[PDB]
Ligand binder design. Structure first.
Ligand SMILES: *[C@@H]1O[C@H](CO)[C@@H](O)[C@H](O)[C@H]1NC(C)=O
Ligand SMILES: *[C@@H]1O[C@H](CO)[C@@H](O)[C@H](O)[C@H]1NC(C)=O
Lengths: 48, 48
């Protein structure tokens, strides 16, 4: 080669995504206490 | 007078109850009730 080119290029990389949190009692049952009492019998699904 | 409450009881190895938490009392009790432990480590916890 007898010449050269100074090239600038872009590389786009993801780093993080949105941090989400879920309340089980609001999602599965909302505000009803009967569903909350029945959901208490399902153990540690929501802790997991 | 008894009211509709959610409580967590600590059962001894002999079967007796040795400690209790009223989950509606203060934010610390709500933090303890969101987990299943009477001891909470240092950190920030989302509470139900
Ligand atoms: C290299 O290329 C540049 C851009 O076209 C030009 O100005 C320059 O004269 C070239 N150099 C040679 C030695 O040909
Ligand atoms: C459990 O009961 C045994 C037999 O009475 C007693 O020696 C022991 O101290 C008890 N344990 C606790 C943790 O209270």
């Amino acid at each position: 080669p007898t010449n050269f080119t100074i090239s600038v290029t872009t590389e786009v990389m993801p780093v993080s995504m949105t941090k989400t949190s879920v309340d089980c009692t609001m999602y599965i049952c909302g505000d009803s206490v009967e569903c909350s009492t029945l959901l208490l019998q399902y153990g540690s699904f929501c802790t997991q | 007078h008894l009211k509709r409450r959610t409580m967590m009881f600590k059962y001894d190895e002999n079967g007796t109850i040795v400690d209790a938490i009223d989950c509606a009392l203060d934010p610390l009790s709500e933090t303890k009730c969101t987990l299943r432990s009477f001891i909470v480590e240092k950190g920030i916890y989302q509470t139900s």
